[PDB]
């Protein structure tokens, strides 16, 4: 039984949430923000990512060089990432270096220079990032997947933004973005590891007390997405490996089917030929794929957002004449979530998940990420007892009922990259979303 997550508020509405571990000597403190690329419009798309670069480019006090030195002297490191719905800025340090790290984070968030000279310098760095993501095939695939599934909607935009915006982002629009979005009621200060909650609340009162509150404070993790069944083909015959993602509209964080979708995802599961145990996994798809050498890997996913999600699978394969078989067998395993699954598969997946959801949290950064994600999506940290109860409530009837309304005979979004000549057209893929025998 893990220690209790303590939670306090300030007057402005900043949440402080902490989970102490007296067995470790490091601590991860940081700020989780319920804001991301989705908060931009089409004209300033890319701003949130642009800001993340400038946050480390110097503040009103410390210059770029002083900032570097201050963190070097702390001994740990700082890290940040911007997603579609969430921004994180954290600092991993030693136990007694926590007041330094909180102070630096408070500085870079509230008091950043955003000097025209630095805007102009990063404008090239970010322009170069546009031509080098091209190599990270999984990210290429998932960014096209969002672009097509949520065609012309805010979730469909990339985080980097178009080349055109990168050239026209001003310090004005950067400042406007962080003034509108980085408000106290949307922020959580999180500490995990060797942190005292009461110490962290004092540091919050010292550094984050003059944060703006929004005019209309909605609860944390408050949002209409209209999924488009569609496909993007990025054929490249010179690549040896095909990367394919197939997804349907999935579930939001607060859906009543959130756990049912996780159990269904666990019934299909993951596979990787390079891992020794993967040839012996219980999943039917795993057995088909491994016995027939259909793929190097596959990974089931169930991504959630505040008001929608994508549920599906990501496949990689060198077997370019049997891509059809790989896709066929994958979608026939999905069909069986509607037609055939019983207590046998459901209870096995629940067993595997009850541990999996706890196992994931194995370091201070993972714990901090879990507290931060849960607080900014659900408004609370859900105790393992509650999670165990929600998983236990999933029956085989729930899985079949969910699959029949979410997967069965539904439109898919499909992205293929690489040697995908063998991937059939949209209709033949989408026809595998049902079984004529049922």
């Amino acid at each position: 039984v893990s220690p209790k997550t303590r939670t306090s508020n300030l007057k402005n509405g900043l949440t402080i949430a902490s989970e102490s571990n007296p067995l470790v000597q490091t601590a991860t403190v940081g700020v989780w923000i319920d804001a991301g690329s989705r908060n931009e419009n089409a004209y300033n798309n890319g701003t949130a990512h642009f800001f993340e670069h400038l946050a480390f480019k110097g503040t009103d006090k410390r210059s770029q060089h002083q900032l570097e030195l201050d963190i070097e002297n702390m001994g740990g490191h700082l890290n940040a990432y911007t997603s579609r719905e969430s921004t994180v800025y954290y600092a991993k340090s030693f136990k007694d270096d926590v007041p330094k790290s909180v102070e630096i984070l408070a500085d870079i968030l509230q008091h950043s220079k955003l000097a025209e000279s630095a805007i102009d310098r990063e404008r090239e760095v970010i322009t170069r990032e546009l031509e080098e993501v091209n190599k990270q095939y999984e990210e290429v695939v998932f960014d096209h997947l969002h672009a097509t599934a949520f065609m012309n909607q805010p979730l469909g935009r990339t985080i980097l933004g178009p080349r055109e915006n990168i050239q026209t982002i001003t310090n004005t629009e950067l400042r406007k973005f962080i003034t509108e979005n980085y408000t106290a009621d949307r922020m959580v200060l999180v500490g995990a590891g060797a942190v005292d909650h009461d110490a962290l609340v004092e540091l919050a009162e010292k550094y984050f007390s003059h944060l703006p509150s929004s005019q209309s404070p909605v609860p944390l993790g408050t949002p209409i997405p209209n999924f488009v069944g569609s496909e993007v083909r990025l054929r490249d015959d010179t690549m040896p490996v095909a990367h394919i993602a197939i997804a349907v509209e999935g579930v939001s964080w607060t859906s009543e089917d959130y756990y049912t979708a996780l159990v269904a995802q666990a019934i299909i599961g993951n596979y990787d030929r390079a891992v020794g145990t993967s040839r012996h996994q219980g999943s039917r798809l795993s057995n088909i794929v491994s016995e027939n050498n259909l793929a190097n890997s596959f990974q089931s996913f169930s991504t959630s957002y505040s008001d929608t999600g994508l549920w599906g699978i990501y496949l990689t394969s060198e077997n370019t004449t049997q891509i059809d078989d790989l896709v066929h067998f994958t979608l026939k395993e999905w069909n069986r979530l509607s037609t055939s699954v019983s207590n046998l598969q459901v209870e096995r997946a629940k067993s595997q998940l009850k541990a999996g959801l706890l196992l994931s949290l194995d370091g201070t950064t993972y714990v901090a990420e879990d507290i931060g994600r849960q607080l900014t999506t659900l408004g609370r940290r859900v105790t393992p007892a509650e999670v165990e109860a929600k998983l236990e409530a999933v029956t085989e009837h729930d899985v079949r009922a969910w699959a029949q309304k979410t997967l069965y005979d539904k439109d898919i979004a499909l992205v293929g990259l690489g040697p995908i000549e063998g991937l059939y057209d949209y209709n033949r893929i989408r026809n595998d979303m049902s079984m004529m025998r049922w």
Binding site: N73, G276, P384
Partner: protein, 402 residues
């Protein structure tokens, strides 16, 4: 970690407040003890294959019912087999390790179809990073055998089933086995290990064939898949100051989208190259390495010159600020290593299998600017510099140029 003994086996455990336990068997069976090249990698990959009580298939299916996970790796010193599971499932995992050490059926088909192909993919994935290759090449030049043996199984020298079975006969013995339990009640683990590992052979301590000898030289691994360069300096007397020096010289940034304030980090400005100084203590010898990877051989060459200069400059004078920055970066590195389960297990494993007491992160020594500059001076004035170049080797520096 309360160190004890259960039926001749050294057991160290630390209770915690988490639902998740990590149990690791650390074996004195890393590559420095490898009878034939690659055997310690193969033996690692042969863990949790078919045993007499339980098939590999049955083990994996039951592990999924517990939602446990399995992690294995080989170092120059150890083979580490780790399981991660829920606290309550401890007895199952203890018995599983017992079956592996006592009753593994080393079958030829498992070697040909399961173990060797997985070993080969493991290595190919590691080599995708040219910096990995460069640092491996550097150890091979510096030590030749023992520490200079390859960690991984390679194609040019095949490991046979008789090789692996012989090595396992030596390694899988009470004298070469340590059990390390994170978030495991220490009294409960001692009771279980004491019943499960009672019939394990006693065996003898595995030893390195021959003494560690240091050599200088050059390795020129011509690849087409990226460029890297290691500058290593073999150390005959491993001293803890080299940790402080590695962290001082640094190389990686402590901040996104930054270069860093470390001397080696500042050596990369204007280049798309990265750099990392590392120190490897192996008890009886050590290796201080500076690895530079990049897409341009011209830029790598440029950074390599600045890197050697940085080390010479350090040998001249360190400031008090810089010495304190080294203490801070080094204490932090020690702390995170004792937290990470992979490295944690091997640290206590070394304490249990040898007798080298762990240096707790809170007890990491502060080195004065005098002590740091002295350490850097010895390295700049080494009689046996090693340089391993990987990639377009015709365009990378040579030892005599540096």
């Amino acid at each position: 970690f309360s160190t004890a003994e259960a039926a001749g086996v050294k057991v160290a455990a630390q209770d915690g407040q988490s639902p998740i336990s990590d149990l690791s068997v650390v074996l004195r069976g890393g590559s420095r003890y490898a009878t034939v090249p690659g055997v310690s990698h193969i033996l690692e990959k042969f863990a949790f294959q078919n045993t007499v009580p339980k098939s590999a298939l049955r083990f994996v299916r039951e592990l999924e019912l517990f939602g446990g996970k399995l992690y294995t790796h080989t170092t120059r010193e150890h083979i580490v087999l780790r399981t991660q599971f829920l606290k309550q499932d401890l007895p199952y995992f203890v018995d599983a390790f017992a079956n592996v050490l006592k009753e593994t059926k080393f079958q030829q088909f498992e070697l040909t179809e399961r173990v060797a192909p997985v070993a080969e993919l493991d290595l190919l994935k590691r080599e995708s990073d040219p910096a990995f290759t460069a640092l491996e090449a550097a150890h091979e030049v510096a030590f030749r055998t023992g520490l200079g043996n390859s960690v991984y199984a390679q194609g040019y020298s095949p490991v046979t089933l008789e090789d692996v079975k012989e090595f396992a006969r030596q390694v899988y013995a009470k004298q070469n086995v340590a059990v390390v339990g994170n978030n495991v009640v220490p009294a409960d683990l001692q009771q279980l290990v004491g019943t499960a590992f009672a019939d394990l052979q006693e065996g003898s301590k595995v030893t390195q064939a021959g003494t560690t000898t240091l050599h200088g030289g050059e390795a020129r691994v011509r690849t087409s898949t990226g460029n890297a360069l290691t500058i290593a300096l073999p150390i005959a007397e491993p001293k803890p100051v080299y940790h402080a020096l590695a962290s001082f010289l640094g190389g990686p940034a402590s901040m996104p989208w930054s270069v860093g304030a470390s001397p080696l980090a500042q050596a990369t400005v204007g280049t798309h190259t990265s750099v990392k100084a590392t120190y490897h203590n192996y008890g009886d010898a050590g290796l201080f390495a500076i690895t530079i990877k990049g897409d341009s051989p011209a830029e790598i060459s440029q950074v390599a010159h600045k890197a050697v200069q940085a080390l010479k400059d350090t040998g001249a004078e360190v400031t008090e600020e810089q010495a304190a920055r080294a203490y801070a970066k080094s204490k932090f590195a020690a702390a995170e290593a004792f937290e990470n389960p992979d490295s944690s297990a091997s640290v206590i494993g070394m304490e249990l299998l040898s007798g080298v007491s762990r240096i707790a992160p809170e007890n990491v020594q502060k080195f004065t600017p005098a002590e740091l500059s002295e350490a850097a001076a010895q390295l700049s004035a080494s009689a046996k510099p090693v340089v391993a170049a990987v990639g377009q080797v015709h365009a990378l520096p040579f030892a005599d140029e540096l």
